[PDB]
């Protein structure tokens, strides 16, 4: 096959993507070993769905798991009557999701389960895939002539040929695995044929962070979770928290081998120590550095010029309400809260008005990073930790380090009941989620 | 008695105003004729209660009417558990209102009934009195040495020695009467002894407006409904809508007689005409000019200088929500609405958070003036009709002419359930009222 493994792509045909996927325990080869994972479409990751604005998507999910499951159309501004976080597909049953791709939309999105209390083991076991919305912007020469690849960043641990079970400590921290994979492959080699690469990046891990850095190279950020930036932004490194996506251009500078690494990052995960008083909780410290892939540059690379502009970000109406959402932890109980409460599917926490804009101030009063995800309604991050964001783009997950406040502009789009939650999925399962009703 | 009639004053003693008032049909002399009114304390207007910040008020109201009644402590930022707009005192029963006067408070307030559907006939019949909160600011020489008077502006119509009954047209327009009185007196004479007067003004009419102008003189506005301005504001005239209060300084310029008039004002009241197609509604047009009192200036008047400053207006926290409240009419049905609904005491319309500030945009989409009153939570008028207000002061009633939007800054103070409504009281009785819950 191609030196660089990527998930099989399924494209809409004649404006329709009609597909049946089963969620099924699947024996497969992963990182040189045989394992049984939980997969969509018999693969890990699941197939990449590639669509255009205005396409119809008709996806029938068959549940061949021993427990209920569903799909969250993560990042898509569609109706929560379709992207329904309360829906349960029982074992053996099927459900058809049908929606139209919004007109003003582009980027890398993804699909995975969202059923309170069940997300972490299902996601960890392999139930995820990407969804790419292709834009007329892809046709500009600076993007069209780039070599494009999707990188699904997802770690795994195996025990007895199956995904390792969650320990109590995993429920507290969020589970990370020793197999740090790209598209299900262990440190693949990307032998570039063009001098400019266009990399779509997805963090589909339960809890692992990727402090991305390519040796000897900057990255040019061109899209965040849910759409293009207004112009490329040069960065020396790029942190992707669980649930986040980004697209970058890489301009290969000379011939050679360059490692794409996940540099050390301390997200505040904890262990337990008994030193004679004790036991108490003790910081794990920064993650060990990981090589994600080997990037081989072609001979005498001459990268394309960067596009001068991408997409103008919409001018939003003035906001009509400010919300404050405070995140806290009870680490030893592995319980997590928003404004002092755990999730209850019967309780509406926020009531907002469709087509108005809100300001959400999300404050992390815990000691570990918590990435915050809002379904259905993409937002503009204004600032985090008191620092203005250096670009405008749609996001649906925002990372908060201990103590930080994120200020978000939140246009409310589709009416209905939806959720917001921590995207360290264990924390969501263990209570850090609330309900938003838009009317 | 004194040439200028004013209501008898009852002052707090040793920090306590303890008083029993009965609401009772009372035979009395009014404007040269004998009439039976509904009164507090056996007089029309009721007694003026004069208190200081931090005083305790303990007022027992005995209901000697044939229908239920209560008190609204109009303009006072106290608890709606005391100033309770849903409380009914049955005929023959008594209720004791007890509260502390807030520390940061000054001005002319008033008391009158507030029971949905019953306000207009009770108020019209005479149930009202003033409440003055005296400030340490009263001791500055520019105010202390002024000659002070209260002017309760209230019209009346009599039929068979009793207040005239409401007609259907009265419920549509709000009832106005032909006897245009000051402190229950018909065109009294105020023989000034000082060159500077300090006039506290109260519009206690059901619906009549007073476009105030003193012949040959400007007025210096020094307080609005619920407190002092930051500095005096010179005006050539001053419109007081139903429920509004103001305090002005008058600087008598020369010897002579000067009329204080209510100049013609068109509030959009309607009549009915049959001209051969018809009948349809037709504008009443502006009110006829009325003389309110004769003001006689003393010999060689030398007015005091104006105070350079009064009270700095508090710097308010940034608002956390914007509300839009739209006022509309069905004139032929005499029904009045806020956001398309009539009042229902069981239905909460707005839910806000104590100690936050809200922006309320109140929009009059009717054709007649509607003054808008909010209980419990005094507000700062930012603009009306797109015109910035020329001063900062606390108000609790704001007038809106046809089509105008008023933008208010509304700090939410006491917790509990309260109301907001049109202060053309007939319109409140006929539906133009809503419920605010503060938590």
Could you walk me through the main structural features you see in this protein, from its secondary elements to its overall organization?
Two copies of one chain form a homodimer. With 439 residues, the first copy, chain A, is mostly beta strands. Chain A has three domains: 1-134, Cupredoxins -  blue copper proteins (Immunoglobulin-like), CATH 2.60.40.420; 135-311, Immunoglobulin-like (Sandwich), CATH 2.60.40.420; 312-439, Immunoglobulin-like (Sandwich), CATH 2.60.40.420. Helix content of chain A is 5%, strand content 47%. Chain A is globular. Chains A and B meet through loops of A and loops of B. Chains A, B: Its EC number is 1.10.3.2. Chains A, B: Cu(2+) 6 binds at residues 375, 421. Chains A, B: Residues 30-136, 172-263, 324-438 form the Plastocyanin-like domain. Chains A, B: Cu(2+) 5 binds at residues 370, 422, 427.
């Amino acid at each position: 096959g191609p030196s660089f493994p990527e998930p099989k792509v399924v494209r809409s045909q004649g404006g329709l993507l009609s597909l049946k996927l089963s969620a099924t325990p699947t024996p497969l080869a992963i990182a040189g070993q045989r394992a049984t994972l939980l997969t969509y479409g018999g693969s890990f990751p699941g197939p990449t769905l590639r669509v255009r604005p205005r396409d119809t998507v008709r996806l029938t999910l068959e549940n061949r798991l021993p427990e209920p499951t569903n799909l969250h159309w993560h990042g898509l501004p569609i109706s929560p009557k379709v992207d329904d976080p309360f829906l349960e597909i029982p074992p053996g049953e099927s459900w058809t999701y049908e929606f139209t791709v919004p007109k003003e939309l582009a980027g890398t999105f993804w699909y995975h389960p969202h059923l309170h209390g069940r997300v972490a083991p299902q996601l960890f076991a392999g139930l995820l895939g990407a969804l790419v919305v292709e834009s007329s912007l892809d046709a500009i020469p600076e993007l069209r002539e780039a070599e494009e690849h999707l990188l699904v960043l997802k770690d795994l641990a195996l025990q007895g040929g199956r995904p390792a079970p969650h320990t109590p400590m995993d429920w507290m921290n969020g589970k990370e695995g020793d197999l740090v994979l790209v598209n299900g492959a262990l440190r693949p080699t990307l032998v570039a044929q063009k001098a400019t690469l266009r990399l779509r990046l997805l963090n589909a891990s339960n809890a692992r962070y990727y402090r991305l850095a390519l040796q000897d190279h900057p990255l040019y950020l061109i899209a965040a979770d849910g759409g293009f930036l207004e112009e490329p932004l040069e960065v020396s490194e790029l942190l992707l928290a669980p649930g986040e996506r980004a697209e970058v251009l890489v301009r290969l500078r000379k011939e050679g081998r360059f490692l794409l690494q996940a540099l050390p990052y301390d997200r505040g995960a904890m262990g337990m120590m008994d030193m004679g008083g004790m036991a108490h909780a003790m910081p794990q410290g920064p993650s060990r550095p990981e090589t994600l892939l080997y990037l081989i540059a072609p001979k005498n690379p001459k990268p394309l010029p960067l596009p001068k502009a991408l997409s103008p970000f919409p001018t939003l109406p003035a906001p009509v309400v400010t919300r404050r959402l405070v995140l806290t932890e009870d680490m030893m109980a592995a319980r997590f809260f928003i404004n002092g409460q755990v999730f209850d599917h019967r309780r509406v926490d926020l009531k907002g008005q469709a087509q108005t804009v809100e300001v959400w101030e999300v404050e992390n009063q815990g000691d570990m990073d918590h990435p915050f995800h809002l379904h259905v309604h993409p937002f503009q991050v204004l600032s985090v930790g008191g620092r203005p964001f250096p670009y405008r783009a749609w996001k649906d997950v925002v990372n908060l380090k201990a103590g930080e406040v994120a200020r978000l502009l939140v246009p409310l789009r589709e009416k209905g009941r939806t959720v917001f939650h921590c995207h360290i999925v264990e924390h969501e399962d263990r209570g850090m989620m609330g309900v938003l009703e838009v009317g």
